[PDB]
Amino acid sequence: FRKMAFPSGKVEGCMVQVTCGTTTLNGLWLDDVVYCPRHVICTSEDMLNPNYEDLLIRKSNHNFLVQAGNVQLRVIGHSMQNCVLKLRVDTANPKTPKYKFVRIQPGQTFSVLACYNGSPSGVYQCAMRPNFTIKGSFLNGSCGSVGFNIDYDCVSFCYMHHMELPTGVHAGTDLEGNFYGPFVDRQTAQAAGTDTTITVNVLAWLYAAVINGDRWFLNRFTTTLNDFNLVAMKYNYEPLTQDHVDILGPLSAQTGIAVLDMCASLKELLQNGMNGRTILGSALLEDEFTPFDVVRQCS
Amino acid sequence: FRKMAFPSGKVEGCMVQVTCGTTTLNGLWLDDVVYCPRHVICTSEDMLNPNYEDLLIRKSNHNFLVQAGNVQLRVIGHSMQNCVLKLRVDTANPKTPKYKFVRIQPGQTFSVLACYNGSPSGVYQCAMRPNFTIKGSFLNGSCGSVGFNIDYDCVSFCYMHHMELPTGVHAGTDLEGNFYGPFVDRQTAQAAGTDTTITVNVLAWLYAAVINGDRWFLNRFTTTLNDFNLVAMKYNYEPLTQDHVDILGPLSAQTGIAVLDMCASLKELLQNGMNGRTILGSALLEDEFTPFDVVRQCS
Ligand SMILES: *[C@@](O)(CO)[C@H](C[C@@H]1CCNC1=O)NC(=O)[C@H](CC(C)C)NC(=O)c1cc2c(OC)cccc2[nH]1
Ligand SMILES: *[C@@](O)(CO)[C@H](C[C@@H]1CCNC1=O)NC(=O)[C@H](CC(C)C)NC(=O)c1cc2c(OC)cccc2[nH]1
């Protein structure tokens, strides 16, 4: 198994660049609106402690340079929604895919299309950590790059890139401008909360192992969900939600291993370790594959 | 620092479905030619030992059903180049990018666009192993998926997918239809030569780790090129040439770490193990980033 991104073409056709003064970043052109991080309106000095409502009043439509390639799109309106700017343009993007804006939960994976000056550069899979950071690869100029999943040609946009933490992980918003995690779009050193292991994804990994005949860790025990969650937290694992239990349903049906039976197997792994053995060839338990990712790659 | 694929949009617009009888796979549509694996002409019985020229002479243009999305393309002629079939169609692909066919060297990387029934499914980075396999993710119906690099809007196609070895690694051809490695397009269980580790890539990856702020594996020792190669060959690593040393020049200049100093670090990692520590999140030495991959991503 390996990290597989979605084909990026439907998103590539939506990337533009947005410039205010000398500040340039990326934007997302869907129908006749361009979405981008609101800090494009900031001068490099104003980012240190910005007042976005006051900064935005000083701006007019003609202050915004939106370019598809080197072709300018005329801006006819502007508004701010949380930390994203919405620029109405006079052309509906003919490459707009079927799309949705969704806000994901920790553990969910998505593809990131890293972009610079409106030009796509590369694509890779990320997982939203429980501390609401992602382990990306982003340089200067990457803000406004988006993350997405594609289901039956419908693109669900879930991430817009804003910041690199001092630890080198990355933080951002959904496409309604609401940050994931406790971060703010100011030029300031911010720290995420201590991270945890994504339990639902580790369980997905164990199901993947079972699907492939690697099942030594299956045990004779079961557990209640509450009992499991209390043990999980003492090993820095996330507690399971009812939604986690339900997204494991398909894999549980496919293998015949009840979710709570797999929880009891993981619990034993947590208290006694792998004892020198491997699962799917690895000595480490992987927590960046969702149940959907496993089904995607196994079936 | 992440395994990063090229944006796949320019290739997505070229993927089609090719069907001959009950056999279907993917094809690559460029200008007015569709390229696909020639075993699409084989029935299940033919595939055990196909005499391809004999089988192709018996097919007509209308035996080939080519579908692009929903629209059917009419085949107006066909020729065979080694293991690749070239179907001339009566419509030019309007989305054909600037492109080239290239045969890549062992150790080089490329992006794979995995496709099923002519529809792109996922994108990820692969390296051509020294034993001329690739460690990919391909399921039933993935034949004809292609591997590629992109440089300033020009797509260099280097791989077309044909088979999965019993070990789970993958084998295929260049776009001239010549296999990488000693493999043959027949339905038999085929073994590869013993694989070795791409030494220059491991070194590039260690430099990537240093550029990203990890230095724990460095040491105060040096080695000569030949003494390093002696230990490298002992551990089934490929020899490091003076060309490799020169290619690593920029990464050494960026970090101020002499190439042979980093060879001494790798020598220690090989002789001492990693001791449960990790480099860029990996518990194993990674050899599928080239020096260019590191430079392109880190800057
Ligand atoms: C954008 O592209 C801005 O348009 C940029 C993306 C990062 C640059 C390097 N890698 C990236 O991911 N984002 C920023 O520069 C943001 C801008 C804010 C949200 C207005 N700032 C940071 O990410 C940032 C600031 C500071 C900092 O200060 C002082 C100290 C430490 C870390 C840090 N990150
Ligand atoms: C294609 O898609 C065929 O159109 C298919 C791709 C593989 C299927 C599973 N994963 C893949 O990557 N390729 C094949 O099925 C090829 C067909 C050849 C080129 C005619 N065959 C194999 O990959 C193959 C055959 C055998 C085998 O026999 C007997 C025994 C063991 C392994 C094996 N692999």
Largest contact between chains: A-B, 29 and 27 residues
Give the CATH topology of the domain at 199-298 in chain A.
main proteinase (3clpro) structure, domain 3
CATH class bucket of the domain at 199-298 in chain A: Mainly Alpha
Estimate the strand proportion of chain A.
Answer: 25-35%
Q: Characterize the overall form of chain A.
A: elongated
Q: What structural class do you assign from the helix and strand content of chain A? A: alpha+beta
Domain Peptidase C30 (chains A, B): 1-299
Protein name (chains A, B): 3C-like proteinase nsp5
Subcellular location (chains A, B): Host cytoplasm; Host Golgi apparatus; Host nucleus
Active site (chains A, B): 39 (for 3cl-pro activity), 143 (for 3cl-pro activity)
Structure, explained:
2 copies of one chain form a homodimer. By secondary structure, chain A is of the alpha+beta class. Among the domains of chain A are: 10-89, Beta Barrel (Thrombin, subunit H); 199-298, main proteinase (3clpro) structure, domain 3 (Orthogonal Bundle). Chain A is built from 8 helices and 13 strands. Chain A has helices at 9-12, 52-57, 199-211, 225-234, 242-247, 249-255, 259-272, 291-298, and strands at 15-20, 23-30, 33-37, 65-68, 71-73, 75-81, 84-89, 99-101, 109-116, 119-127, 146-151, 154-164, 170-173. Chain A has a 7-stranded antiparallel β-sheet, with no helix packed on it. In chain A, a hairpin with a 2-residue loop joins strand 4 (65-68) and strand 5 (71-73). The first copy, chain A, is elongated, with a radius of gyration of 22 Å. The relative contact order of chain A is 0.14. The A-B interface holds A 1-10, 12-13, 113-114, 120-124, 135-137, 139, 168, 282-284, 296-297 and B 1-10, 12-13, 113-114, 120-124, 135, 137, 212-213, 281, 283, 297, 299. Chains A, B: The active site is at 39 (for 3cl-pro activity), 143 (for 3cl-pro activity). Chains A, B: Residues 1-299 are cytoplasmic. Chains A, B: Residues 1-299 form the Peptidase C30 domain.
